[PDB]
Write a protein that holds these residues in place. Structure first.
Motif, mmCIF file in Angstrom:
data_model
loop_
_atom_site.group_PDB
_atom_site.id
_atom_site.type_symbol
_atom_site.label_atom_id
_atom_site.label_comp_id
_atom_site.label_asym_id
_atom_site.label_seq_id
_atom_site.Cartn_x
_atom_site.Cartn_y
_atom_site.Cartn_z
ATOM 1 N N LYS A 23 0.824 -1.190 0.000
ATOM 2 C CA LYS A 23 0.000 0.000 0.000
ATOM 3 C C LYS A 23 0.876 1.265 0.000
ATOM 4 N N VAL A 24 0.465 2.278 -0.737
ATOM 5 C CA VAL A 24 1.187 3.524 -0.747
ATOM 6 C C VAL A 24 0.374 4.553 0.025
ATOM 7 N N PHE A 25 0.787 4.927 1.243
ATOM 8 C CA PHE A 25 0.065 5.914 2.053
ATOM 9 C C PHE A 25 0.001 7.320 1.475
ATOM 10 N N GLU A 26 -1.033 8.118 1.805
ATOM 11 C CA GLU A 26 -1.021 9.500 1.384
ATOM 12 C C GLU A 26 -0.368 10.154 2.588
ATOM 13 N N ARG A 27 0.196 11.331 2.468
ATOM 14 C CA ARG A 27 0.870 12.017 3.564
ATOM 15 C C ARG A 27 0.140 12.107 4.915
ATOM 16 N N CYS A 28 -0.994 12.834 4.922
ATOM 17 C CA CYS A 28 -1.809 13.008 6.127
ATOM 18 C C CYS A 28 -2.380 11.736 6.755
ATOM 19 N N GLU A 29 -2.715 10.784 5.903
ATOM 20 C CA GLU A 29 -3.262 9.514 6.286
ATOM 21 C C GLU A 29 -2.212 8.785 7.120
ATOM 22 N N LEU A 30 -0.961 8.864 6.669
ATOM 23 C CA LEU A 30 0.097 8.207 7.450
ATOM 24 C C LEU A 30 0.371 9.014 8.731
ATOM 25 N N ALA A 31 0.331 10.350 8.598
ATOM 26 C CA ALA A 31 0.575 11.218 9.743
ATOM 27 C C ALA A 31 -0.368 10.793 10.888
ATOM 28 N N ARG A 32 -1.663 10.669 10.519
ATOM 29 C CA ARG A 32 -2.652 10.296 11.515
ATOM 30 C C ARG A 32 -2.453 8.925 12.092
ATOM 31 N N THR A 33 -2.093 7.965 11.224
ATOM 32 C CA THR A 33 -1.860 6.598 11.623
ATOM 33 C C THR A 33 -0.708 6.501 12.604
ATOM 34 N N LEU A 34 0.386 7.180 12.318
ATOM 35 C CA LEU A 34 1.551 7.129 13.203
ATOM 36 C C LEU A 34 1.213 7.695 14.589
ATOM 37 N N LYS A 35 0.422 8.773 14.585
ATOM 38 C CA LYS A 35 0.039 9.386 15.845
ATOM 39 C C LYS A 35 -0.678 8.398 16.728
ATOM 40 N N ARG A 36 -1.682 7.756 16.163
ATOM 41 C CA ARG A 36 -2.494 6.768 16.820
ATOM 42 C C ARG A 36 -1.652 5.634 17.371
#
Length: 130
Positions: free
Chosen positions: A1-14
């Motif tokens: 899967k290729v993450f979009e920027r913000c989507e990964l940002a949010r995921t990492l935070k969580r």
């Protein structure tokens, strides 16, 4: 899967990476960008030493995961390297936390020094709501 920027940002935070062992979120984002382009399926063979870099964070088989084929390696994260190629990054995150728990910390990834250290990395998380 290729993450979009913000989507990964949010995921990492969580996933609890913000400020992990003193490492800001923006830094982990800079790392993932330069190592895999945010691609969880990325692999890179290092002919030089016979090891392979796996997943989003390009985690090396010499020390962190087991691939069976790397000479003299260890598997600090107790995982098969295969686990780092899934679309879910739970394993990648737990292993990356393990990596930085060693003295070198984030410096263990040379691209972080070349590309992220001493730079304004806020751009990686701007506008993402984290």
């Amino acid at each position: 899967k290729v993450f979009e920027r913000c989507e990964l940002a949010r995921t990492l935070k969580r996933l609890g990476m913000d400020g992990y062992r003193g490492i800001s979120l923006a830094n982990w984002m800079c790392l993932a960008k330069w190592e895999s382009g945010y691609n969880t399926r990325a692999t890179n063979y290092n002919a030089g030493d016979r090891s392979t870099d796996y997943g989003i964070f390009q985690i090396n088989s010499r020390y962190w995961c087991n691939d069976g084929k790397t000479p003299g390696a260890v598997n600090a994260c107790h995982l098969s390297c295969s686990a780092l190629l899934q679309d879910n990054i739970a394993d990648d995150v737990a292993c990356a936390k393990r990596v930085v728990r060693d003295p070198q910390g984030i410096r263990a990834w040379v691209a972080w020094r070349n590309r992220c250290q001493n730079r304004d990395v806020r751009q990686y998380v701007q506008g993402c709501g984290v």
